Design a protein around this motif. Structure first.
Motif, short mmCIF file in Angstrom:
data_model
loop_
_atom_site.label_atom_id
_atom_site.label_comp_id
_atom_site.label_asym_id
_atom_site.label_seq_id
_atom_site.Cartn_x
_atom_site.Cartn_y
_atom_site.Cartn_z
N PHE D 7 10.26 -0.97 -24.69
CA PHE D 7 10.75 -1.62 -23.48
C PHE D 7 10.49 -0.77 -22.25
O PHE D 7 10.42 -1.30 -21.14
N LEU D 61 12.38 -9.35 -20.60
CA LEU D 61 12.23 -8.32 -21.62
C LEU D 61 10.75 -7.94 -21.67
O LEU D 61 9.97 -8.49 -22.44
N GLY E 54 16.06 -3.27 -22.89
CA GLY E 54 14.93 -3.88 -22.20
C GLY E 54 15.32 -4.88 -21.14
O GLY E 54 14.66 -4.97 -20.10
N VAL E 55 16.39 -5.64 -21.39
CA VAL E 55 16.80 -6.68 -20.46
C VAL E 55 17.15 -6.06 -19.11
O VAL E 55 17.55 -4.89 -19.02
#
Ligand SMILES: [Zn+2]
Lengths: 114, 23, 83, 96, 60, 206, 155, 126
Positions: D7, D61, E54-55
């Motif tokens: 991420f 995301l 990640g969000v």
RNA sequence: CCGGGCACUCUAACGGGACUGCCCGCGAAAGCGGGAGGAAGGAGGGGACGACGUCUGGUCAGCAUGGCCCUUACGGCCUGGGCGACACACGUGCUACAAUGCCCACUACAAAGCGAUGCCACCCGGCAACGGGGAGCUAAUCGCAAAAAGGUGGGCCCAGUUCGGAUUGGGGUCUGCAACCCGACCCCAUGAAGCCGGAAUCGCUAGUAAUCGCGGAUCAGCCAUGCCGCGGUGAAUACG
């Protein structure tokens, strides 16, 4: 002319056939084929042997004008007799196919009554 | 028009395929 | 409509009851919660109080109602107009 | 041939650059860190719990992708390969 | 009448079609994300919470 | 009513996520779920110790857990009893290898949550809301904070009419992205309802 | 439009005649961004007038525009219990656009089925100083000049 | 010999190559008019070659991707402007005054939530 | 297509780059207008970002929550029906009323996302929906997936139309345990109103409007014309 009505001479046979109640583009697109008739020819542009071919053919293919209207009212008539929900809708003259009865049923209810 | 299932365009706007919108 | 490739759906317990009274002859008016089934040609001549959501509405089964669902002849809503 | 998915890009690049030296430490080919297109997955939502559908808020995301390949596996590296340092925001794929 | 209802959504029904998705966090039924299982609100809460790896606010 | 959450507004800019663990579509939802409950289980199990942060990273088949707290000795227990008491009890919930860790709150007068928490327990004990706020905000700024603000909404002081009290000090630039601004929320509920507590601590525009 | 005057867009000169004004007339032809459609419809009428009265179509074009370029018009003004329509001049910026909008509308109303001919007849009668578009320009300034008593109320 | 530029105009990428000749134009293995047949606007792509007049000098092998042909056309106007000044930087004079050497900053604006389009707010009745 | 190369685009990270930076003039300055360069020039465009507070705004039906309220029931289960009614009225949308059009066939050109019990290539049968097979894909590589409008040619010839598709009859496909109320899609037939719409009224200043199509969320299914985005073409006008 043909089974119930006449085809417009200045129009091509394609739309002319569809002018028969009980005939859309499909059967119009087909009867010329089974009768081998060129669609481009106007109704005025039609020979007798073609028409009698097509006439007897289409008149012997599907009930179009009167016989068709018989079963149509018949199908709704037989519906109203059993008292099905569908028959209820017809006998009430309301949208039979699950339409939103509250609004936008003018097509089944016609003018507005305020 | 765009609301005609028989029209290819109708199935286009309908985003489906039938006799009149091959795949 | 239900895919004819698939069988004609009928609530078996209700269907089975009908086949039961067939052996026992037309009798024993069948109350049913099973609006969703389709009438079977055996069902003709019978009668059912089809459940309408609050009530079991009596329906006599004729051949004119063979190829239909049971609930169709039990109107689940009562309309009488306005005023 | 190794994939990297996370991420962060830094942790990927931190992870990737570390691994890129790793096979570089004792082998080749160390296929360069190739940034695959970052699969993003949007998530939109009303800010309010009740109505006021209009006021929204977007979320995402970015599963950032990076990758490196090994032409010659160089089993001396292969032990070095399995001897890996995986931070908590990285996943890895195996090939060659 | 929600807990047994949100409990009933947990057990398995007589038919798979009855299986719907409630929020794992608030039990909500509408606006429920298969990828998260959270309602649109629980997502936003946990989103700003930073617990969502990640969000983040997607602002292109 | 109209302002943005400061933490989510700064994720990946100056502030970092609280549970870093890559996941796929198949396992993101499941691994999230136990991750949520882990925040709760440690929450009650560490609120007395003064919980600050619960960082939950996920290595291969073991949750990299990190709890920030002002009372590490209160966390570990009798020379490390409670830690094992939870490090096992935690893994019982998550099922995987619950790797538990504790981290002290250096200068707990900068932990926006703890600063929120401490104000809560005070207002949890009927202390002067308007006073506790200033006393709260004061040592926060007194503890080197480059800017601090505290707000509280609800039935302030048992009044049947709600109200929002708040005191601030030092620069609190909420709009500055690179302004490191720790947010702290405290849910302080009373006998007569619930009081919301928010802690804003500007530290440095790193 | 309170702070600045929002200066005009510099149109791209067309491929055929290298004109922006031609490009301008196309835009009034263009519908739904369908400039490819509208482009032919002009260039077709180019051929058409090039056939009927074979000359420079652009020579026909601007000559058509000159015959419909207005120069005086009214403007509503409800001063008091009477709404005035003051006779007003027209900027060349607005002279063309009004005239441009006028011709295309009249071209939207001729009977010939394809638009390229309606444009064809329109620009012809336009350069001929004839047709409702020319009448549109005639009626306005007449209507405009008919109310010259409100001239000094011009703002 | 070989000369290159790049075309970008509203999601349209244009790889332009200038090889000297009579002014050939291959667009994705096609003739200009071939790949642009029925395109009114699709004639000005060579106008930079009509600004500086090596029309029958350089044979144009070009590819394009993304967006409609029109956007593809603008990218062509970009790429043509590139290799020219790369070929002759003196071409920048009579191009910068002609604006060929600047990329069209216009882009399809982001569609907003609430707004039907980038600025299309729904009709409201108070 | 391959080897072959990273040129190019692209992919995705780091940087540079625009700072009135520079020249003219005005200005006390601030700044301001002109120009140069410049991809970008004067806030480069668009986002995210919403101060004190206001509306005792909305939400106890997301959640949490004081308090009041029921406990063989207002709690829980099941079954079905309702939330889909319908003389009516309003809001918000879609499709149109046609030739700048409609239909048919061929030919192009995107973006952005999605996908392991899902995309399903491809093949066959089937008018079709779709069904029987069936590879790859585990994701820049497999597929969804065709972009559509556009272009070519053909037809239609102003017609309530080859406009319009509403309604309805019938025959089917799929999902689903089950499509009666109450699904969608296919086919045949049916072919409604509607000829640009009073009073009034809305949005939009640029890649905007307008128009064309594409993906995703929820979801088995879909009642989605909605929503969120994505791209194609692509405007007019701003005196004030
Ligand atoms: Zn939730």
């Amino acid at each position: 002319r043909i089974a119930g009505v006449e085809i417009p001479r200045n129009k091509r046979v394609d739309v002319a056939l569809t002018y028969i109640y009980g005939i859309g583009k499909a059967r119009a697109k087909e009867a010329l084929e089974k009768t081998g008739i060129n669609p481009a020819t106007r109704v005025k542009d039609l020979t007798e042997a073609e028409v009698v071919r097509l006439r007897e053919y289409v008149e012997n293919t599907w009930k179009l004008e009167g016989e068709l209207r018989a079963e149509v009212a018949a199908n709704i008539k037989r519906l109203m007799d059993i008292g099905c929900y569908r028959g209820l809708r017809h006998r009430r003259g309301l949208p039979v196919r699950g339409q939103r009865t509250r609004t936008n049923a003018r097509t089944r209810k016609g003018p507005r009554k305020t | 028009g765009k609301g005609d299932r028989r029209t290819r365009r109708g199935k286009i706007w309908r985003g489906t395929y039938g006799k009149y919108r091959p795949r | 409509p239900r895919s004819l490739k698939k069988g004609v759906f009928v609530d078996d317990h209700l269907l089975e009851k009908v086949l039961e009274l067939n052996a026992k002859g037309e009798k024993r008016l069948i109350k049913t919660w099973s609006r969703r089934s389709t009438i079977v040609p055996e069902m003709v001549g019978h009668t059912i109080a089809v459940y309408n959501g609050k009530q079991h509405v009596p329906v006599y089964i004729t051949e004119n109602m063979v190829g239909h669902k049971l609930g169709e002849f039990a109107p689940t809503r009562t309309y009488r107009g306005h005023g | 041939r190794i994939k990297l998915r996370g991420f962060d890009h830094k942790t990927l690049d931190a992870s990737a650059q570390k691994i890129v030296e790793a096979a570089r430490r004792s082998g080749a080919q160390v296929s360069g860190p190739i940034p695959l297109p970052t699969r993003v997955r949007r998530f939109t939502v009303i800010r309010g719990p009740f109505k006021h559908k209009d006021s929204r808020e977007h979320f995402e995301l970015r599963t950032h992708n990076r990758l490196v390949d090994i032409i010659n596996p160089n089993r001396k590296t292969i032990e070095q390969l399995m001897t890996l340092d995986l931070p908590t925001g990285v996943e890895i794929e195996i090939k060659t | 009448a929600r807990k047994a209802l949100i409990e009933k959504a947990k057990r398995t029904p007589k038919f798979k079609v009855r299986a719907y998705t409630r929020c794992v966090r608030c039990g909500r039924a509408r606006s429920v994300y298969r990828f998260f299982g959270l309602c649109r609100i629980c997502l936003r809460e946990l989103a700003h919470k930073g617990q969502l790896p990640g969000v983040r606010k997607a602002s292109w | 009513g109209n302002k943005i959450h400061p933490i989510g507004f700064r994720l990946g800019i100056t502030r970092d996520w609280e549970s870093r663990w890559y996941a796929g579509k198949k396992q993101y939802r499941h691994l999230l779920l136990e991750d949520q409950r882990i925040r709760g289980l440690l929450e009650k199990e560490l609120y007395s110790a003064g919980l600050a942060r619960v960082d939950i990273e996920r290595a291969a088949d073991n949750v990299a857990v990190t709890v920030h707290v002002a009372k590490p000795g209160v966390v570990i227990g009798r020379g490390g009893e409670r830690i094992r008491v939870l490090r096992e009890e935690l893994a019982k919930l998550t099922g995987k290898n619950v790797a538990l860790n504790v981290q002290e709150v250096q200068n707990p007068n900068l932990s926006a949550p703890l600063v929120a928490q401490r104000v809560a327990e005070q207002i949890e004990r009927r202390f002067a809301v308007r006073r506790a706020i200033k006393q709260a905000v004061q040592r926060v700024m007194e503890s080197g904070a480059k800017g601090a603000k505290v707000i509280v909404s609800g039935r302030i002081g048992g009044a049947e009419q709600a109200r929002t009290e708040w005191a601030a000090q030092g620069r609190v630039p909420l709009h500055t992205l690179r302004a490191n601004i720790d947010y702290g929320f405290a849910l302080a509920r009373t006998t007569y309802g619930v009081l919301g507590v928010k802690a804003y601590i500007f530290l440095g525009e790193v | 439009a309170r702070r600045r005057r929002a200066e005009v867009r510099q149109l791209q000169p067309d491929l055929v005649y290298g004109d922006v004004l031609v490009t301008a007339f196309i835009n009034k032809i263009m519908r739904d961004g369908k400039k490819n459609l509208a482009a032919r419809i002009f260039y077709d009428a180019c051929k058409i007038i090039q056939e009927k009265t074979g000359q420079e179509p652009l020579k026909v074009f601007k000559q058509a525009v000159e015959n419909v370029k207005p120069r005086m018009e009214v403007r509503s003004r409800r001063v008091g219990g009477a709404n005035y329509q003051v006779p007003m001049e027209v900027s060349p910026r607005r002279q063309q656009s009004l005239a441009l909008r006028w011709l295309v509308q009249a071209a939207n109303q001729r009977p010939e089925r394809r638009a390229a001919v309606r444009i064809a007849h329109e620009l012809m009668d336009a350069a001929e100083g004839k047709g409702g578009a020319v009448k549109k320009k005639e009626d306005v300034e007449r209507m405009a000049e008919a109310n010259r008593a409100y001239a000094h109320y011009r703002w | 010999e070989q000369y290159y530029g790049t075309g970008r105009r509203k999601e349209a990428v244009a790889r332009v190559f200038l090889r000297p000749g009579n002014g050939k134009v291959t667009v994705n293995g096609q003739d200009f008019n071939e790949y642009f047949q029925g395109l009114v606007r699709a004639v000005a792509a060579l106008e930079p070659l009509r600004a500086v007049d090596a029309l029958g000098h350089f044979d144009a092998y070009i590819t394009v991707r993304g967006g409609g042909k029109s956007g593809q056309i603008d990218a062509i106007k970009l790429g043509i402007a590139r290799a020219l000044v790369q070929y002759n930087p003196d071409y920048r004079a009579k191009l910068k005054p002609l604006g060929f050497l600047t990329r069209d900053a216009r882009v399809v604006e982001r569609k907003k939530y609430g707004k039907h389009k980038a600025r299309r707010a729904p009709q409201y009745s108070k």
